[PDB]
Design an enzyme around this catalytic site. Structure first.
Site, PDB file in Angstrom:
ATOM      1  N   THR D   1       0.823  -1.351   0.000  1.00 11.09           N
ATOM      2  CA  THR D   1       0.000   0.000   0.000  1.00 11.09           C
ATOM      3  C   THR D   1       0.777   1.276   0.000  1.00 11.09           C
ATOM      4  O   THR D   1       1.983   1.238   0.182  1.00 11.09           O
ATOM      5  CB  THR D   1      -0.872   0.081   1.261  1.00 11.09           C
ATOM      6  OG1 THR D   1      -0.206   0.074   2.522  1.00 11.09           O
ATOM      7  CG2 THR D   1      -1.830  -1.144   1.162  1.00 11.09           C
ATOM      8  N   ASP D  17      -3.588   3.281  -1.473  1.00  7.10           N
ATOM      9  CA  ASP D  17      -3.625   2.304  -2.503  1.00  7.10           C
ATOM     10  C   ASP D  17      -4.133   1.082  -1.859  1.00  7.10           C
ATOM     11  O   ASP D  17      -3.789   0.747  -0.735  1.00  7.10           O
ATOM     12  CB  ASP D  17      -2.158   2.083  -2.964  1.00  7.10           C
ATOM     13  CG  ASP D  17      -1.911   0.854  -3.868  1.00  7.10           C
ATOM     14  OD1 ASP D  17      -2.609   0.739  -4.924  1.00  7.10           O
ATOM     15  OD2 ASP D  17      -1.079   0.022  -3.410  1.00  7.10           O
ATOM     16  N   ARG D  19      -4.741  -2.805  -1.849  1.00 10.02           N
ATOM     17  CA  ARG D  19      -3.968  -4.026  -2.143  1.00 10.02           C
ATOM     18  C   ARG D  19      -3.366  -4.511  -0.837  1.00 10.02           C
ATOM     19  O   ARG D  19      -2.717  -3.781  -0.063  1.00 10.02           O
ATOM     20  CB  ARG D  19      -2.741  -3.786  -3.086  1.00 10.02           C
ATOM     21  CG  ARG D  19      -2.057  -5.101  -3.529  1.00 10.02           C
ATOM     22  CD  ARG D  19      -0.778  -4.992  -4.370  1.00 10.02           C
ATOM     23  NE  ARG D  19      -0.113  -6.372  -4.478  1.00 10.02           N
ATOM     24  CZ  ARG D  19       0.732  -6.637  -5.489  1.00 10.02           C
ATOM     25  NH1 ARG D  19       1.059  -5.682  -6.427  1.00 10.02           N
ATOM     26  NH2 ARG D  19       1.085  -7.955  -5.719  1.00 10.02           N
ATOM     27  N   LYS D  33      -8.007   0.422   4.288  1.00 12.67           N
ATOM     28  CA  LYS D  33      -7.182   0.894   5.359  1.00 12.67           C
ATOM     29  C   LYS D  33      -7.532   2.276   5.750  1.00 12.67           C
ATOM     30  O   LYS D  33      -6.890   2.896   6.550  1.00 12.67           O
ATOM     31  CB  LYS D  33      -5.732   0.823   4.957  1.00 12.67           C
ATOM     32  CG  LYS D  33      -5.160  -0.639   4.698  1.00 12.67           C
ATOM     33  CD  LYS D  33      -5.446  -1.638   5.746  1.00 12.67           C
ATOM     34  CE  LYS D  33      -4.717  -1.367   7.018  1.00 12.67           C
ATOM     35  NZ  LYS D  33      -5.104  -2.361   8.030  1.00 12.67           N
ATOM     36  N   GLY D  47       1.061  -0.974   7.576  1.00 18.72           N
ATOM     37  CA  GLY D  47       2.037  -1.709   8.341  1.00 18.72           C
ATOM     38  C   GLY D  47       1.553  -3.087   8.606  1.00 18.72           C
ATOM     39  O   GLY D  47       0.973  -3.745   7.780  1.00 18.72           O
ATOM     40  N   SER D 129       5.049   1.199   1.498  1.00 19.32           N
ATOM     41  CA  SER D 129       6.202   0.581   0.969  1.00 19.32           C
ATOM     42  C   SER D 129       6.674   1.353  -0.235  1.00 19.32           C
ATOM     43  O   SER D 129       7.904   1.385  -0.571  1.00 19.32           O
ATOM     44  CB  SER D 129       5.996  -0.923   0.658  1.00 19.32           C
ATOM     45  OG  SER D 129       7.302  -1.530   0.482  1.00 19.32           O
ATOM     46  N   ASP D 166       6.410   0.718  -7.761  1.00 12.32           N
ATOM     47  CA  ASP D 166       6.505  -0.333  -6.780  1.00 12.32           C
ATOM     48  C   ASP D 166       5.767  -1.522  -7.197  1.00 12.32           C
ATOM     49  O   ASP D 166       4.606  -1.454  -7.588  1.00 12.32           O
ATOM     50  CB  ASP D 166       6.078   0.088  -5.404  1.00 12.32           C
ATOM     51  CG  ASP D 166       6.875   1.321  -5.006  1.00 12.32           C
ATOM     52  OD1 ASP D 166       6.459   2.391  -5.465  1.00 12.32           O
ATOM     53  OD2 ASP D 166       7.719   1.181  -4.059  1.00 12.32           O
ATOM     54  N   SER D 169       2.884  -3.019  -4.995  1.00 12.12           N
ATOM     55  CA  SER D 169       1.663  -2.282  -5.000  1.00 12.12           C
ATOM     56  C   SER D 169       1.019  -2.430  -6.387  1.00 12.12           C
ATOM     57  O   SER D 169       1.715  -2.476  -7.402  1.00 12.12           O
ATOM     58  CB  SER D 169       1.943  -0.758  -4.818  1.00 12.12           C
ATOM     59  OG  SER D 169       2.460  -0.492  -3.589  1.00 12.12           O
TER      60      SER D 169
END
Lengths: 218, 233, 239, 222, 213, 205, 214, 242, 234
Positions: D1, D17, D19, D33, D47, D129, D166, D169
């Site tokens: 994310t 994001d 996922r 989230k 996290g 991330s 990324d 993601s």
């Protein structure tokens, strides 16, 4: 526990009229001179003097408990009672307990004073070993300085020839030259039989041939 | 009335503000044995009477070796006294371990007092009903104290506990000046005489009841027991 | 019922003991009054002494609880002083924990709950005090809250304290029809006036102790003599 | 994310994001989230999933108690401190990077919390991330005097950059605009690449599979 | 971290008569290659014709000694009656068995006189345990000195032709002779030698100095 | 191998239209030594709600019994039924307590609510985070592969008869993946009018 | 410490003058080339006369600072008027000592009271409490030591001190570290507390660097 | 039965309890102490009645110290005063070290005030029956004198006095100067007041005791005995004989 | 003490077999300002009277209806301080238990918790029970609602009830007038009438407090809204 800001080299002796103590004024943090011109001198009562070496933080902590001792009881709490032989024992017990928890302190202290007729000079360590000897030195001073002092103080008539300050002054110059983890300034304090006296900020004196041979700066 | 009320409250306060509990405690001291205390202030002596309940018995001690420089006589019941005595011996032991000093008996006496006083200051605790004459040879000499179960701490140069205490007091005041800072022998004679005043006085002097205990300049705790007082008689 | 060593529910509907706290809550002769405006909130108290072997520069009955909040206490001295100490700790803690300012009202309600428990214990009595909270909020404006030790608290348009409260109430109602017509100082003047009529004392510079809370400031301040005399002089001119 | 926050003068946009990944395989294609701790105080959390949820529930609880007792609108700064206090006591185990945002009469405010116990306020913040990639785009792209449309376009780009660069993601992007005059939850703003493909498989009756034991159980009570 | 074990012990020798005992010790105390102090014995007079010595570390040695002394005082208070040697022997062990968790230790020995008009010496291990002796050397230098000490004083080995019975005088000569010899074979022996001589008259101390180099 | 792997096991659930399905393995050995080809790791609580658990067997027995205690008492106090959602939560709370300890379990919930007539599935993680499942649900050590198969095999509309073929082949593929030889499997096919239980025929060593 | 570690240059000092103390410090904390925290304050009011410079790890320092505030707040209402000297110093020490080695705080507490004047105390990692004539802190000290040794200025002006801190800090960040941005300052006097802010482009090309303070 | 001697955790028709009034009667029943504060410092003086010659003082007095800058005097029961006091010094000391300051007089009072009020709310612990007079000279604040009552009331004073004599003493005190010359002069003056007070108390001898905290003492707490006490005595003996 | 005091209770079995303290609390209840409740089936109405007695007041400061939750509300008759405290503990318990779960609160469970706290105080001494009676009002789905909780520790369901002064007389009025299908607006008209009949000192839009549970649970009526109903039928 573990060293943080530390002090080294506290020298002491006994003499006819008193005990004499000398110590540099340094707070090093490994080798960075965090504090220059820092005391190590705790007067205890007015008739006893503690010179302390080791961790400086720990020192502050101990000063306060000592402080509580005389601000209590009807008369002063280090007045009629609490002799230096008592103050020495009390201190030793305190190291002993810490060591038993194995959450230790990190200082070596000299308790010096006069009793009422007799010189008191007694040692305590992180190990916690307690003794009285006429001559003591800490740190680097324990290895290097103490045989120089010992020639004078293992010969008892030769002690009697002079007031000691000169041996002390001399040793401290050799000490400053050989070691540069030491600082040029020192304080010297004398506990006489009835009185206590501190000579403030001195710096090492510049020798004759020795000054050419060896300097004190890096 | 309300006698039972005043027993039931240990927090008692009356219109006259008296505390009866203390009063009761005083009657219990007077119920005990006869003991005198005397000091020259370089020697201190105590004549103490040790008595026996019946013919086929033998006398029970009321002189206790608390320490090898300090000591007491008890006057009141034996059972409570034992309990106090352990606390004081242990207080002497840590003084020796930690400080390696005898410690002023004056300083000691004051500390013991507080710890008792505070439970009278709240629920629970009955009076302990033993009074003491506490002697000891300290740094500034011998000193004498009277500890009461009213925690009334007083230093006196001589004192007495036991019914007809006052009698002997008056003689002590009279002879007081003669005591001076000398003679062992003299102090004991006056004590033997004085002790006669405390008793009803129909009972004649006896060597099995009396007991003589001294502490002094180079003396520590010693007891003269039974016959042993005859040499010094 | 049995008040003797316990307190219970009774057909009385109240408790003899709760009434007795209401009744004697002053053992002197001070009286107090508080009025609320939108320009100020003022509490007017007295200064009195029995002799002059006593100081008067530490003697006070007005407490600064915190910067914004002020508290005047009517109650037994021992009990008034205790409660302040307890409050001081509770407020500070509320500031630490929440990170935001403690509302005046919030304190009165919290304190009230502490009073109430003690009313349930037959092993402990409630403290004997009436606490008047005054303050300047930015969330409804100034606020005036009185507590009583039954566990009762409420906010009022103005209130009075001492033993002659009802007498002061009568003046207050007359006044309270119009009070938004008073400017700053003129609030203060009227406030002096209603204590002087009840108490029947035309005040003197060292007998009076006006405390004011000021809008657009988080100040609680006890007024200087010059200002206090300026008012006193002001009522003379209308006599 | 990747979770981000951009503040503008009449509100805040938060975006994230969507996922969830386990291994190299996708555990949840769609997830959320975006957490409700209050009706005007929101936090997004990233996290460890298990750490994130547990805190959201505790904190929501404490705040709600305050909210009724006082009778007034709460503060985010209080929400930040109750979270900050928690982390200091456990002395680490928790692995949740939260962006706590909120709108008040006091102003829009925007914070982040780092599981080390460190929080700050900045006009824009991102964690993920993806964080390092988004952050490069952000610095350049940020200009003051943002408003709703400008923020929105920027935020949409911002997530789109994290998805591309990324590899951990991917999938849809969720945006949520919080104004002090309305709340908008924006369900799939962009829809990129899909879950898989049909590689064939055809059907036939249960009879083509040799069965060991067959059993019934009529169920008449619904 | 910091040590939970430091050495400091000397060397001592306990010799048992049959109406006397002597316990002799160097004053030199050292650890390794740096010298802690050129003085102080580890033999002490407990009193009443009990002599005790605790070899291992100075920190432990003072503390045990002080502590025992109160148990004896307390006991006498509790009713007039005193510990015998044997009593003391059990008392030290319980302390040690406790200390089996504690990481510092000492090798203790007690000596004195019985009311059987003879010596008793009991020796302890640094975990607890007791044994009856005739003679014991303790400390560092002990292991080397002892077979020879056992033979010269004793004559109880399977490698001697005769016996002779002890004499005090004779015991004193042997003791000095062993120590003077010990010194050029250790750096844990030296300086001076403190002799506690135990008789039924009372406790006497003798000191003689030794070599150093 | 792991703290969940000593007896392996995998569990699958797939959803159909107007029905749901849960399939599982059976086998219990001791380490790698297969003693028996039986051991249920799915239990139901009321007809229609099924709960599949996938830790170590030891853990599973204890957890299944805990859920019984809680649920029964809860059901009693409220005096009306529990929902599927309610079971899911309960599991989370329990999952949270075990997180310090070495009891790590993966549950999966499946059932079709018949007082609401909607299908319901969820999976839950062994750190305690609930993740609401859709269309397919996986559990076991084989999961990475299993996931692969579930993304491929599924088709948006399913009839119990088609659903039956889908799970069977899934189960067939799955037993080849085991190194622990977890042979024997059960299927439960759930309708809001009927449940079918099927044990399936498969490889034997 | 809890879960950070700083490996970059820090540069803080408080320098005393007649009117009071002037504090300066850098802004932003960094761990590596990646920016741990952007331009931020650590010149904190925990009182109106009493300010601190925070250094080390962020989480620890923040926690310590509120905790002292609580105590001093209770203390202020009842004793009235707080002086910096014995009273601030001890409360910070006890915590540093107790929390011991799970604590990373380098604090310069500087305060101005008309009671004894302005004071400067320095918390090292051991928590020694030292009255200083003036103090320099941080890891960047090592860069500034030489400057102060060379210049040998004495005599204070608000203006003179502002240049002094500006060249020292500027240089320190330049050679090593990855800390920079804004340098922020407070001159604390009887006037009140005056806040100065200087941009990172206005802060180079200074000189002067006192060592004797008289 | 009144039904409230039994309690001490409740209200009465008199408000506070009877037990609390009684404690106030008992201090007045005791001997007599005064205190006078000045701008240079503060003087304490107390009358002690002599019992008999056997006795002697050596740890039991009526003047007590607090810390090593604080002076303490009391009326009421000796043993209980000593019990309050040992704890106060200790509480003061932990402060003294902890905040690093040498405690105020005012803070000490607050700490004692709170203790006594708490004991009035409960029936567990019967109150003290003492009244304590404390004060000193603070280097930067001045002299301040306080008195704490067993009635949960405490104030700052120019003079305070307690004992049987109370009303009468405050009258004489009231007659005198605000400044009252210098401290030294006050030592003589207080001695006249006690000297004269004793004609009213006379049934047996007394011993005059004086103490001080002076500019010359440099704010420390000391007893005034010595020749200094005797001169003040001579001056009273000359003036009147009463 | 700090653990001493009265371990057994003030309340005690009698040779009557009655509980004295309990009997007194029905009296404690009796003193309360007039309260009613009407269940409008789809809605719920609770109403009471604010007496007023000092003109000096502010706002509409404290209430006598406080929300426990967003779905259940309490109103009472008995002692006010007890009410504030009672609400705080429950309010704490309602949130904590139903945030473990995400399910919304069932009515009966709140009743079970309030009664236990009331009952423990009956079991134990030192502290006395509360002397309040509550009307637990909520809405949720198609469930039954409107419940009563006693200082006794007992609960009952009702369709309608009344509290406060002259409780028996008002209830008798209530019994006759209240029948069959009614409306949420209609239930309010009736409740005002039933309160007026019990006593009117006056009624204004500040002597009345009415709250309902209907759309999405508890909603608080505006002062104007109620006033519209007063005109709608006085």
């Amino acid at each position: 526990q573990n060293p943080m800001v530390t002090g080294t080299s506290v020298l002491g002796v006994k003499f006819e009229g008193g005990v004499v103590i000398a110590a540099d004024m340094l707070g090093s943090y490994g080798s960075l001179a965090r504090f220059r011109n820092i005391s190590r001198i705790m007067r205890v009562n007015n008739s006893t003097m503690l010179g302390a070496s080791g961790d400086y933080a720990d020192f502050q902590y101990l000063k306060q408990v000592l402080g509580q001792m005389v601000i209590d009881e009807e008369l002063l709490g280090d007045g009629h009672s609490y002799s230096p032989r008592a103050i020495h024992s009390w201190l030793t017990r305190a190291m002993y307990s810490r060591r038993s928890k194995m959450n230790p302190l990190w200082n070596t202290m000299v308790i010096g004073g006069y009793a009422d007729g007799e010189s008191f000079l007694g040692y305590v360590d992180m190990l916690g070993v307690a003794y009285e000897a006429p001559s003591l030195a800490t740190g680097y001073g324990a290895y290097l300085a103490q045989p120089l002092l010992r020639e004078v103080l293992e010969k008892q008539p030769v002690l009697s020839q002079t007031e000691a300050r000169d041996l002390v002054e001399r040793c401290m110059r050799v000490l400053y030259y050989r070691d540069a983890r030491s600082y040029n300034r020192f304080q010297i304090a004398t506990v006489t039989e009835k009185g206590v006296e501190i000579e403030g900020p001195l710096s090492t004196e510049t020798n004759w041939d020795i000054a050419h041979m060896i300097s004190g700066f890096e | 009335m309300f006698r039972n009320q005043y027993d039931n409250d240990v927090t008692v306060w009356s219109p006259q503000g008296r505390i009866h509990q203390i009063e009761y405690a005083m009657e219990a001291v007077k119920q005990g044995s006869a003991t005198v205390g005397l000091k020259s202030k370089t020697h201190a002596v105590l004549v103490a009477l040790k008595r026996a309940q019946s013919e086929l018995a033998a006398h029970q001690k009321k002189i206790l070796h608390v320490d090898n420089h300090i000591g007491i006589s008890i006057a009141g019941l034996t059972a409570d006294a034992r309990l106090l005595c352990n606390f004081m011996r242990q207080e002497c032991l840590d003084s020796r371990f930690v400080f390696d000093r005898p410690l002023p008996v004056s300083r000691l006496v004051s500390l013991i007092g507080s710890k008792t006083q505070i439970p009278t200051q709240r629920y629970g605790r009955r009076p302990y009903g033993v009074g003491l004459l506490i002697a000891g040879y300290d740094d500034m000499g011998p000193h004498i104290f009277q500890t009461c179960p009213s925690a009334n701490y007083f230093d006196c140069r001589a004192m007495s506990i036991g019914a007809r205490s006052q009698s002997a007091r008056t003689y002590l005041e009279r002879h007081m000046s003669e005591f001076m800072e000398c003679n062992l022998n003299e102090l004991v004679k006056h004590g033997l005489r004085a002790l006669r005043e405390t008793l009803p006085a129909e009972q004649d002097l006896t060597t099995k009841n009396v007991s003589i205990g001294i502490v002094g300049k180079d003396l520590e705790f010693t007891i003269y027991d039974d016959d042993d007082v005859s040499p010094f008689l | 019922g049995f008040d003797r060593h316990i307190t219970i529910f009774s057909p009385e509907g109240r408790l003899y003991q709760v009434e007795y706290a209401f009744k004697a809550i002053n053992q002197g002769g001070l009286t107090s009054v508080a009025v609320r405006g939108k320009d100020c909130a003022v509490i007017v108290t007295q200064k009195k002494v029995p002799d002059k072997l006593l100081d008067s520069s530490t003697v006070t009955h007005l407490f600064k609880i915190t910067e914004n909040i002020g508290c005047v206490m009517t109650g037994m001295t021992a009990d008034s002083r205790s409660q302040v100490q307890r409050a001081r700790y509770e407020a500070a803690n509320w500031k630490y924990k929440y990170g935001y300012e403690i509302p005046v009202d919030m304190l009165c309600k919290r304190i009230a709950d502490i009073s109430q428990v003690y009313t349930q214990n037959a092993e402990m009595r409630p403290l004997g005090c009436c606490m008047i909270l005054i303050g300047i909020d930015e969330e409804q404006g100034p606020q005036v809250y009185k507590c009583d030790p039954a566990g009762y608290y409420c906010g009022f348009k103005a209130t009075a304290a001492g033993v002659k409260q009802t007498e002061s109430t009568s003046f207050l109602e007359k006044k309270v029809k119009k009070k938004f017509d008073w400017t700053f100082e003129q609030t203060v003047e009227t406030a002096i006036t209603c204590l002087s009529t009840v108490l029947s004392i035309d005040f003197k510079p060292s007998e009076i102790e006006v405390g004011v809370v000021t809008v657009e400031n988080p100040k609680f301040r006890i007024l200087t003599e010059a200002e206090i005399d300026a008012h006193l002089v002001a009522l003379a001119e209308r006599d | 994310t990747t979770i981000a926050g951009v503040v503008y003068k009449d509100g805040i946009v938060l975006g994230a994001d969507t996922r969830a990944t386990e291994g190299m395989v996708v555990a949840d294609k769609n997830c959320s989230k975006i957490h409700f701790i209050s009706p005007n105080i929101y936090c997004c959390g990233a996290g460890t999933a298990a750490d994130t949820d547990m805190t959201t529930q505790l904190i929501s609880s404490n705040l709600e108690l305050h909210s009724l007792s006082t009778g007034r609108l709460p503060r985010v700064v209080t929400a930040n401190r109750m979270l900050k206090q928690m982390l200091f006591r456990y002395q680490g185990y928790i692995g949740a990077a939260l962006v706590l945002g909120g709108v008040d009469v006091t102003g829009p405010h925007l914070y982040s919390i780092y599981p080390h116990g460190s929080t700050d306020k900045l006009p824009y913040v991102t964690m993920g991330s993806g964080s390092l990639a988004a952050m490069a785009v952000f610095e350049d792209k940020f200009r003051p005097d943002m408003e709703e449309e400008e923020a929105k376009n920027l935020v949409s780009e911002a997530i789109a950059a994290g998805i591309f660069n990324d590899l951990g993601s991917g999938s849809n992007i969720d945006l949520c605009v919080i104004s002090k005059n309305k709340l908008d939850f924006l369900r799939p703003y962009t829809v990129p690449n899909k879950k898989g493909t049909r590689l064939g498989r055809y059907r036939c009756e249960k009879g083509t599979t040799a069965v060991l034991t067959e059993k019934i159980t009529p169920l008449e009570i619904e | 971290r910091f040590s939970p074990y430091v050495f400091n012990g000397g060397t001592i020798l306990a010799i048992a008569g049959e109406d006397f005992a002597i316990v002799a010790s160097d004053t030199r105390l050292s650890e390794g290659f740096s010298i802690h102090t050129r003085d102080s014995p580890k033999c002490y007079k407990l009193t009443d014709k009990t002599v005790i010595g605790c070899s291992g570390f100075h920190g432990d040695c003072l503390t045990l000694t002080k502590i025992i002394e109160a148990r004896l005082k307390m006991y006498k208070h509790s009713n007039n009656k005193a510990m015998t040697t044997g009593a003391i022997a059990a008392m030290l062990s319980t302390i040690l068995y406790s200390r089996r968790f504690f990481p510092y230790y000492v090798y203790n020995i007690i000596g004195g006189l019985d009311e059987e008009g003879k010596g008793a010496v009991y020796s302890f291990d640094p975990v607890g345990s007791y044994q009856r002796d005739s003679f014991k050397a303790g400390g560092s230098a002990s292991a080397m000195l002892q077979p020879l000490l056992d033979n010269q004083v004793g004559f109880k080995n399977m490698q001697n032709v005769e016996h002779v019975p002890l004499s005090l005088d004779r015991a004193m000569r042997l003791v000095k002779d062993v120590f003077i010899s010990a010194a050029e074979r250790d750096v844990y022996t030296g300086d001076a030698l403190r002799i506690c001589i135990v008789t039924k008259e009372g406790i006497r101390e003798e000191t003689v100095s030794l070599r150093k180099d | 191998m792991s703290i969940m792997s000593y007896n392996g096991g995998a569990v699958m659930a797939m959803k159909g239209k107007n029905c749901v399905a849960i399939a599982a393995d059976r086998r219990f050995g001791i380490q790698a030594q297969m003693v028996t080809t039986d051991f249920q790791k799915i239990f139901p609580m009321g007809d229609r709600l099924y709960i599949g658990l996938a830790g170590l067997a030891t853990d599973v027995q204890t957890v299944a019994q805990r859920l019984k205690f809680r649920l029964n008492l809860y059901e009693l106090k409220e005096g009306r039924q529990i929902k599927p959602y309610t079971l899911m939560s309960m599991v989370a709370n329990l999952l949270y307590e075990k997180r310090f300890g070495p009891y790590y379990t993966e549950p999966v919930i499946a059932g079709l609510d018949p007082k609401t007539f909607k299908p319901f599935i969820c999976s839950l993680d062994l750190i305690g985070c609930p993740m609401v499942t859709d269309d397919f649900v996986v559990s076991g050590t084989c999961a990475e592969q299993m996931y692969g198969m579930c993304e491929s095999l599924w088709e948006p509309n399913m009839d119990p008869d088609h659903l039956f073929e889908t799970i069977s082949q899934a189960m067939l593929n799955a037993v080849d993946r085991d190194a622990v030889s977890g042979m024997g499997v059960i299927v439960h096919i759930i309708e809001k009018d009927k449940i079918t239980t099927r044990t399936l025929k498969a490889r034997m060593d | 410490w809890e879960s950070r570690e700083v490996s970059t240059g820090t540069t803080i000092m408080a320098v005393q003058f007649d009117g009071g103390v002037v504090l300066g410090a850098d802004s932003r904390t960094t761990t590596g080339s990646y920016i741990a925290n952007r331009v931020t304050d650590k010149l904190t009011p925990i009182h109106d006369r009493i300010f601190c410079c925070r250094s080390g790890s962020a989480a620890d320092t923040q926690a310590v600072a509120d905790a002292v505030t609580y105590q001093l707040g209770f203390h202020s209402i009842e004793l009235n008027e707080p002086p910096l000297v014995h009273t601030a110093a001890s409360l910070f020490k006890e915590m540093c000592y107790r929390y011991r080695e799970d604590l990373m705080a380098g604090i310069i507490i500087a305060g101005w009271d008309p009671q004894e004047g302005g004071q400067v105390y320095s918390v090292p990692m051991g928590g020694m409490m030292v009255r200083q004539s003036f103090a320099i802190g941080g890891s960047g000290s090592s860069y500034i030591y030489g400057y102060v040794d060379a210049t040998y200025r004495e005599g204070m002006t608000k203006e003179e001190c502002l240049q002094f801190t500006a060249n020292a800090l500027a240089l320190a960040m330049e050679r090593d570290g990855s800390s920079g941005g804004v340098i922020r300052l407070a001159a604390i006097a009887e006037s009140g507390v005056e806040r100065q802010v200087l941009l990172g482009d206005q802060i180079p090309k200074f000189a002067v660097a006192t060592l004797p303070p008289a | 039965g009144t039904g409230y001697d039994l309690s001490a955790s409740t209200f009465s028709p008199d408000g506070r309890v009877f037990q609390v009034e009684y404690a106030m009667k008992a201090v007045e029943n005791s001997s007599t102490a005064i205190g006078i504060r000045c701008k240079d410092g503060v003087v304490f003086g107390v009358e002690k009645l002599v019992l008999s010659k056997l006795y002697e003082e050596g740890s039991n007095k009526r003047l007590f110290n607090v810390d090593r800058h604080v002076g303490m005097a009391v009326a009421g029961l000796l043993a209980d005063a000593r019990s309050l006091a040992d704890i106060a010094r200790e509480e003061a000391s932990n402060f003294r070290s902890n905040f690093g300051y040498n405690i105020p007089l005012k803070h000490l009072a607050d700490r004692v005030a709170m203790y006594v009020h708490a004991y009035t709310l409960y029936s567990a612990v019967r109150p003290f029956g003492c009244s304590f007079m404390l004060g000193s000279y603070s280097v930067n604040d001045g002299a301040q004198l306080y008195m704490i009552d067993p009635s949960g009331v405490s104030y700052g004073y120019w003079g305070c006095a307690i004992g049987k004599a109370r009303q009468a003493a405050k009258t004489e005190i009231e007659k005198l100067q605000m400044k009252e010359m210098t401290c030294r002069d006050i030592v003589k003056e207080v001695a006249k007041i006690i000297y004269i007070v004793h004609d009213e108390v006379k049934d047996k001898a007394f011993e005059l005791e004086l103490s001080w905290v002076g500019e010359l003492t440099n704010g420390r707490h000391e007893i005034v005995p010595k020749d200094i006490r005797e001169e003040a005595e001579k001056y009273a003996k000359e003036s009147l004989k009463e | 003490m700090a653990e001493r005091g009265y371990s057994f209770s003030l309340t005690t079995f009698s040779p009557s077999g009655k509980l004295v303290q309990i009997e007194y609390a029905l009296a404690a209840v009796a003193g309360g300002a007039p309260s009613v409740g009407i269940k409008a089936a789809n809605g719920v109405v609770l109403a009471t009277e604010k007496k007023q007695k000092s003109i000096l007041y502010d706002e509409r400061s404290v209430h006598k209806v406080e929300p426990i939750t967003k779905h259940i509300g309490l109103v009472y008759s008995g002692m006010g301080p007890d009410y504030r405290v009672l609400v705080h503990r429950a309010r704490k318990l309602a949130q904590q238990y139903y945030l473990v779960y995400q399910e919304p609160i069932p009515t009966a469970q709140l009743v079970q918790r309030v009664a236990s706290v009331m009952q423990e105080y009956t079991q134990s001494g030192g502290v006395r029970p509360f002397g309040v009676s509550l009307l637990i009002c909520g809405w949720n789905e198609g469930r039954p609602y409107l419940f009563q909780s006693d200082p006794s520790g007992a609960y009952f369901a009702w369709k309608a009830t009344a509290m406060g002064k002259n409780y028996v007389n008002g209830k008798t009025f209530l019994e006759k007038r209240y029948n069959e299908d009614l409306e949420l607006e209609d239930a309010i008209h009736t409740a005002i009438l039933t309160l007026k009949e019990s006593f009117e000192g006056q009624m204004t839009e500040d002597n009345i407090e009415v709250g309902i549970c209907n759309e999405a649970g508890f909603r608080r009526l505006t002062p104007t809204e109620v006033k519209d109903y007063l005109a709608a039928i006085a």
